[PDB]
């Protein structure tokens, strides 16, 4: 039986724009911490929330920066840990909110341990219950990505090592994370190695890609985003040119070894949705076909304001199909954006820009790579700056 524990108006500091946004938040006994634009009782409950948080295992801190009566909460949004800053008008109101959130959080821990006692099986009642000895160090790629060769099988991989401070996804155009282990001070990620280089530097050397070449890269990106959305129910969030690499044959490999990419809804502090991936596709394909970003300015205040308020100009070299695709992908309202509807990736797949493309053939790597990397071997690091 879910019930509201506390509700009221909070000022939530913007994560990218220097502002405080008034929101009506509901704290419920299941830990849900849900923010609306208006009170649900004033709009007949017919409006979706803007923010969906969970105060399970949260951390709370009261502070007087930037404003008095501020508190910071480190909580969760579905699977991601986030940090949000709130403001209220009096110290008593802040004490009520921090106490109410903490009381709900403590009640959730007791419910959890009650649930583990009820679901404990016979094996759980017993009295008691990969490593770097494998893999060979070879070279370095990032600033700390290293190139390794598995001692047992003789296969090459790229090991990402991080000091302590998308696992089961398999797709031809996604980098597969094969192994994952840790030490007392480090986290290790053994993932496949695409030695064809970053598209960021390939586009930088070519200045601009043709519409055919961009259609090749875009189609393979769409294929991977369709798999993540429909099969894994995951938003990639980080689709950008720097996270796009090529394998030895010139096919896309989305990897994970930039304020200019932020979607309008993220700049306005709404929760991420599927449509942010299609915005990111619009930005990368605009870069590929125009040789520059749709919005850019050194002053990040100007840049965010261009993204939110100004029209995208397209060069006269862009064909009408290309302009229609980019205009649809770069709609500022995610509900109007191409791919923001219920059919998601099928909206892009059926767009005239991709006419004649058999999307099963894209998955099967039957498209002709317009550029073949000249890598001599799988140890050739010529494409890593």
């Amino acid at each position: 039986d879910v019930a509201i524990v506390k509700e009221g108006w909070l000022h939530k500091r913007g994560e990218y724009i220097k502002t405080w946004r008034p929101r009506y938040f509901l704290l419920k006994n299941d830990g849900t911490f849900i923010g609306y634009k208006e009170r649900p009782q004033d709009v007949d409950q017919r409006e979706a929330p803007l923010n969906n948080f969970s105060v399970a295992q949260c951390q709370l801190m009261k502070t007087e920066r930037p404003r008095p009566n501020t508190f910071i909460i480190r909580c969760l949004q579905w699977t991601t840990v986030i940090e949000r800053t709130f403001h209220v008008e009096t110290p008593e109101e802040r004490e009520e909110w921090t106490t109410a959130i903490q009381t709900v959080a403590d009640g959730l821990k007791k419910q959890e341990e009650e649930e583990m006692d009820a679901s404990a099986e016979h094996t759980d009642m017993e009295v008691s219950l990969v490593t770097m000895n494998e893999f060979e160090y070879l070279k370095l790629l990032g600033k700390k990505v290293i190139l390794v060769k598995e001692k047992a099988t003789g296969r090459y991989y790229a090991m990402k090592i991080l000091k302590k401070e998308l696992q089961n996804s398999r797709h031809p155009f996604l980098t597969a994370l094969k192994y994952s282990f840790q030490t007392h001070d480090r986290l290790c990620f053994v993932m496949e190695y695409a030695n064809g280089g970053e598209l960021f530097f390939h586009l930088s050397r070519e200045r601009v890609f043709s519409e055919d070449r961009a259609r090749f890269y875009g189609a393979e990106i769409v294929s991977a985003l369709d798999y993540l959305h429909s099969e894994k129910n995951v938003v990639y969030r980080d689709l950008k040119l720097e996270n796009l690499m090529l394998d030895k044959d010139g096919h896309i490999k989305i990897t994970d070894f930039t304020p200019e990419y932020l979607a309008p809804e993220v700049l306005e502090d709404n929760d991420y949705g599927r449509a942010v991936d299609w915005w990111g596709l619009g930005v990368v394909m605009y870069e590929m076909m125009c040789g520059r970003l749709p919005f850019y300015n050194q002053d990040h205040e100007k840049l965010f304001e261009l993204i939110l308020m100004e029209e995208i100009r397209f060069p006269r070299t862009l064909g009408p199909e290309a302009k229609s695709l980019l205009s649809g992908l770069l709609k500022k309202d995610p509900k109007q954006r191409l791919g923001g509807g219920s059919e998601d990736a099928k909206e892009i797949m059926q767009h005239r820009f991709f006419a004649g493309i058999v999307w099963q053939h894209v998955y099967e790597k039957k498209l002709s790579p317009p550029f073949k990397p000249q890598v001599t071997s799988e140890t050739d690091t010529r494409y890593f700056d």
Partner: nanobody
């Protein structure tokens, strides 16, 4: 709080029934298990009963011991039949949460004499 009782001195071939009386916690909604600790051996699991009532038993007690729950009394029983001298130990009862926190009651001594 869990209180074991019902132990004592019995002869080989006799029987006993231990009781695990709970106060403050609800065994009706918790997986309950029985344990024993021999003079110089490692503490071992013997039997468990799930919330549904399904029971599982370890090898040395199969066909001899029976674990049951009394929801009305908030108590879990261990019926010990076919006792032999090797069953001599102090017997304990616990939940999962108390098990991982090493929170144990006083237990009840069972001595089976020849």
């Amino acid at each position: 709080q869990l209180v074991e009782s019902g132990g004592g001195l019995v002869q080989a071939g006799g029987s006993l029934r231990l009781s695990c009386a709970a106060s403050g916690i609800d065994v009706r909604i918790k997986t309950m298990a029985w344990y024993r600790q021999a003079p110089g051996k490692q503490r071992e699991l013997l039997a468990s009963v799930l919330v549904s009532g399904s029971t599982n038993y370890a090898d040395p007690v199969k066909g001899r011991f029976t674990i049951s729950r009394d929801n009305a009394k908030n108590t879990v029983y261990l019926q010990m039949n076919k006792l032999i001298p090797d069953d001599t130990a102090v017997y304990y009862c616990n939940t999962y949460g108390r098990l991982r926190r090493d929170v144990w009651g006083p237990g009840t001594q069972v001595t089976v004499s020849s």
